[PDB]
Every structure is written in structure tokens, then in C-alpha cells.
Design a protein around this nucleic acid. Structure first.
Length: 38
RNA sequence: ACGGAAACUUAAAACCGUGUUGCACUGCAACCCGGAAUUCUUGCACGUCG
């Protein structure tokens, strides 16, 4: 059946957030990635 | 055979004995080891499922 479950990042109380490093790394996959269009 | 001829001015004896170049006196009074320098800038927990 359903096995053991992974973990998201939380702050100090179980309250989660999207990381700032990933949303900085999100746009690292954008501005170089977009306008290469040999 | 010259008032002539002989003779030491000589022998010993400590310029010694008592006596501090000594007594009173800060190598002391005043000062900062003190002022100006980002532990920083590049960095996604993810590729992987008959």
C-alpha cells in the first residue's frame, strides 16, 4: 500500500513555505533558457 | 832636634699615642595602544517508473 512519506520544508512549527532559494533557482531556469531561440 | 809627638765630638732613644668623610634627601609629576575595512559575492534536493 502507501509507504512512508517524504517531507516539505517548514519553519519552526510545522508551518511550511516555498523556499527562496528554489524561487531564485526557478528564474535561473528562465532568462538563460528562454531567448536562445542556432 | 816645632809646646812638639798620640787621640772619633763618641755611645745609646720610634715624632709616636686617641680619631668613621659622618649625619637630613622618593628618580618624582603629566599622558587611552587610539583611530576608518560586510564574512563576503556564482549556486533549485533533484534526475529515475516495463
Amino acid at each position: 500500500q502507501l509507504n512512508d512519506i517524504h517531507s516539505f520544508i517548514k519553519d519552526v512549527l510545522g508551518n511550511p513555505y516555498v523556499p527562496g532559494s528554489s524561487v531564485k533557482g526557478m528564474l535561473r531556469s528562465i532568462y538563460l533558457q528562454s531567448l536562445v531561440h542556432q
